[PDB]
């Protein structure tokens, strides 16, 4: 018979975060964000039961150089600990080499974050500005 | 001052294209775009279709 | 402030184990909402609307 | 095998297998590039205030 | 002249019939060149370098 899908993820804004009153909430309703409604509509179209779960180690997933073990949601799926992972996860070859990724629903690139230096134009002193008072 | 660089564009957005009729607009007689706007539900894309 | 263009091209995709029978239909739904533009509405919700 | 600028669509997914995207596409607007417009008489009071 | 942002998010991928054994390895090479960024090099070659 049909079974509830173990959906693993990680708390990340605006993707996944707990609701402000999650303590008096239960199950999937305890969380909120983009990927929440995303996977929600995924179950809407595919017609299955699911369950929102948080990654244990709090990571995306990585392969140990020594023990060759994948951690995070990656290991969760590889070791059958989860049923599916929907998260702001980067798609890489090493990640393809162990599990399957769907077609990318969102294309991204590396970004450069700097400060916002704001120099408001003075109203009074900007008149006598150039040399000195 | 005294710079002829204007680079003025009339529409700059497909919304404004829907907001005008002077400059016509269209695509090929077929394609995934034609089915796109054929099936699109955006009032902009719907009106333009 | 975000400056400069994207240094590369990467994509967000759903992770599913190899051989999972759900990969194909779920990916089909991905193509659906992608073609349904709901992705744009929700991205505007959690990025632009707020 | 088919390697060409073929738009990935659902109905096309419905029958064959597409590879992961090597390039991302968006609808574009091609307009005839206008020339640099001359300002004309109004340049008299144009700068610094309207 | 091209104006305005992308009205949608589409993509191009190599098309292969369902059941083709070459889909997975060719797709792997796609992810390789993507990680190798060669796609940007040739895209510059035939788009911007010319």
Is E9 within 8 Å of chain A by CB? yes
Selection from A92, B49, D18, A100 nearest residue E11 by Cα: D18
Nearest to A96 among E9, E13, E28 (CB): E28
- Name the burial class of residue A55, with classes exposed (0-12), middle (13-18) and buried (19+) by CB atoms within 10 angstroms of its CB: buried
Task: Flag if D26 and E6 touch (Cβ within 8 Å).
Answer: yes
Do A and B touch, counting CB pairs below 8 Å (3 needed)? no
Cβ pair D31, E3 in contact under 8 A: yes
Selection from C4, C5, C14 nearest residue A104 by Cα: C14
Rg (CA), chain D: 24
Task: State the method.
Answer: cryo-EM
Selection from C9, E7, A122 nearest residue B17 by Cα: E7
Task: Enter the resolution in angstroms.
Answer: 6.4
> How far off is chain C from A32, nearest CA to CA, in Å?
11
Task: Flag if D18 and A103 touch (Cβ within 8 Å).
Answer: yes
Is D12 within 8 Å of chain E by CB? yes
Is A104 within 8 Å of chain D by CB? yes
Cβ pair A101, C13 in contact under 8 A: yes
């Amino acid at each position: 018979e049909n079974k509830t899908v173990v959906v693993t993820t990680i708390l990340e804004s605006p993707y996944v975060m707990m609701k402000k009153n999650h303590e008096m909430l239960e199950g999937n309703e305890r969380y909120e964000g983009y990927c929440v409604d995303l996977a929600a509509e995924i179950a809407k179209h595919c017609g299955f039961k699911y369950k929102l779960t948080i990654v244990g180690d709090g990571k995306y997933g990585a392969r140990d150089a020594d023990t060759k073990i994948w951690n995070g949601m990656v290991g969760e799926l590889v070791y059958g600990k989860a049923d599916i992972a929907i998260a702001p996860l980067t798609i890489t070859l090493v990640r393809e080499e162990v599990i399957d990724f769907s077609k990318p629903f969102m294309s991204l690139g590396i970004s450069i974050m700097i400060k916002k230096p704001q120099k408001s134009k003075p109203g009074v002193f900007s008149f006598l500005d150039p040399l000195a008072y | 001052f005294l710079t002829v660089e204007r680079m003025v564009s009339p529409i700059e957005s497909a919304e404004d294209l829907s907001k005008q009729t002077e400059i016509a607009y269209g695509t090929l007689d077929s394609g995934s775009t034609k089915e796109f706007f054929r099936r699109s539900k955006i009032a902009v894309f719907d009106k333009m279709w | 402030m975000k400056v400069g263009g994207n240094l590369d091209s990467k994509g967000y995709g759903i992770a599913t184990p190899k051989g999972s029978s759900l990969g194909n239909a779920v990916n089909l739904a991905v193509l659906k909402l992608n073609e349904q533009g709901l992705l744009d509405k929700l991205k505007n919700k959690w990025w632009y609307d707020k």
